[PDB]
Subunit: 244 residues, 3 copies
């Protein structure tokens, strides 16, 4: 029989986002929360949602297979330390857009290293669709994606160093250099442009998109999101929940 | 002159769907009805819509070039017998999603045979986009589609036997095995996965998608639907209405 | 450093459309105006919007890098003459859909010549998605587009002569002949079918799509629009504003 029907929820996931962000980043979080809610129709998993990460010390995080951060990262020492302990003890992460933002004022070296080394460098403006290219066509995140496709509008970040420079990072999707020169207000002219990657030392994926209220208009990118979430969940060292 | 402008409506079509179905299947029917209404702007055809197939014995069906079943099939003996006579006398059908659902309690062998032999076997859950592949790139349904593309979210059915096992069936679109393992709650791991086909003994096409309120977000799948409808309509043994 | 961040708005653009048009052409204009408004978040450029082109003699047009005509062309002699002088003195144009419509009753030979020679010939009906093909994969308008893709629904125009017959026209995107026979009410069976082009004697692009309230459902076509606008703006003989 080719199908494994769940008898009970398979794993637990936590969504964290903030309402204290530019409007477009709140809009994305709201819609992405709907996206994940719909993935949990029929209670395939346990999904908890919060705007307040202060209530989640490590002891209350450890039960989660994955934390999905839609728009921001922890900003207080206690929250940051809880997240670090979680990730260092085999926790899962799916991060979007400004959840990875960091700069000279972040003062969180653990997180810069968790991301693969990249500090924010530059971005195009305004948000626009772009041609994207799959770096590894065999990977579970991208095996059922077209090798290249146009992703819907976002503003896109470069980092320094590029995450690709880290041999422990696998870049999975990149913005094509065919997009250059990229931008109308703020124009990006050259450089490496990874947009989805994983630091292989952690059970984590980062996706650079997540801006505004039209990110779910295309099946292709929607499938990338499903795949990203599924991959991180499947890799739990305690057992692949999809085999239960 | 390369264009044939209609002087009058070209053919008649009937949409049948039910409101007595899970919410997502009612939503799809409603949106698909809008899709077809828009195709009939300017009265290219006569479009009648019903939620009550009991009012349509064979004598009242025979005038229709095609019946579009958006979410369900006839459930009473009288309705089933009217539909059988219609299809056996050269009628047209475009069916979606659970319009083909059948199982050990259906007790309608004519319809299982009409579909090509397949009884419901399994499905993934939750609805998600998937990579789909065109089986015959030359066919009128698929000649202007990309050879592979991502279709928007649905839950997808396997059947036993596969409709492909029937030599009288032409499979037109299939879910790629690159999608395996497919599912988060209910996981499909292997098997043939046709999703659009025609039993060549009838003027009919079946499309497995049709779930929820976001099935029309992509041009590509929208074009598949146009093409499916146009093909069945064009094949009327009484004459191709598009030549009038 | 690979990015050029604007210090001030880079150029000025004018949108003109009419509310005195079929509903679908007003809907497109409204949504396209939103699209351009969003491109101007953060004041990358100066964007002025009007439904009344009578207020724009040549002296008041000359300051604009580009005029975007979403649904119609000037109909009075004074408006037509202002637009002619503007375009003959290095002005920019991005036109959509019925902004290029012209027939035996237009009586504006300058404009027929500006467009590349084509008078309206025929169209399919109803609006539907179609397979489109990039004619020049290296051009700034199309270099980051897939070589072929399905565009969302519009009704599509043929012209006589084809704009392609003019050696001064570069055709950039064409409706594939794989779409033939095209139409349900009004059926197009053959012929050249360019849909995006530029008369190289002017700083102008024409895009045939622009019908209804669902033209922005796909990233790919959205990217074509961004690229079309950016290309015309970049070519200003007074200097590429993106270098400032
Ligand atoms: Cl803690
Ligand atoms: Cl977009
Ligand atoms: Cl997976
Ligand atoms: Cl009957
Ligand atoms: Cl989807
Ligand atoms: Cl056809
Ligand atoms: Cl003037
Ligand atoms: Cl469409
Ligand atoms: Cl450009
Ligand atoms: Zn606040
Ligand atoms: Zn500091
Ligand atoms: Zn510090
Ligand atoms: Zn491969
Ligand atoms: Zn490849
Ligand atoms: Zn290492
Ligand atoms: Zn953003
Ligand atoms: Zn009921
Ligand atoms: Zn029984
Ligand atoms: Zn029985
Ligand atoms: Zn071929
Ligand atoms: Zn092929
Ligand atoms: Zn046979
Ligand atoms: Zn369903
Ligand atoms: Zn779309
Ligand atoms: Zn009026
Ligand atoms: Zn006249
Ligand atoms: Zn005249
Ligand atoms: Zn090339
Ligand atoms: Zn090529
Ligand atoms: Zn010349
Ligand atoms: Zn139109």
């Amino acid at each position: 029989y080719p199908a494994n029907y769940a008898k009970a929820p398979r794993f637990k996931a936590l969504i964290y986002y903030t309402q204290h962000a530019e409007e477009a980043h709140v809009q994305f979080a709201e819609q992405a929360t709907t996206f994940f809610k719909k993935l949990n129709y029929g209670d395939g998993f346990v999904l908890d949602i919060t705007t307040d990460f202060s209530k989640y010390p490590y002891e209350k995080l450890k039960e989660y297979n994955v934390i999905i951060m839609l728009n921001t990262s922890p900003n207080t020492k206690a929250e940051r330390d809880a997240f670090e302990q979680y990730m260092e003890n085999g926790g899962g992460w799916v991060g979007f857009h400004a959840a990875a933002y960091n700069d000279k004022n972040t003062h969180w070296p653990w997180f810069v290293k968790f991301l693969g080394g990249g500090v924010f460098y530059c971005n195009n403006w305004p948000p626009q669709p772009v041609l994207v290219e799959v770096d590894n066509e065999e990977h579970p995140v991208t095996k059922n994606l077209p090798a290249s496709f146009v992703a819907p509008a976002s503003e896109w970040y470069q980092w320094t160093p590029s995450p690709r420079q880290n041999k422990d990072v696998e870049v999975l999707l990149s913005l094509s250099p065919k997009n250059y020169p990229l931008g109308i207000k703020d124009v990006v002219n050259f450089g490496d442009f990874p947009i989805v990657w994983s630091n292989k030392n952690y059970r984590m994926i980062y996706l650079n998109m997540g801006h505004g209220d039209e990110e779910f208009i295309d099946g292709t990118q929607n499938l990338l999101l499903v795949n990203a979430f599924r991959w991180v969940v499947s890799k739990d060292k305690s057992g692949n929940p999809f085999l239960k």
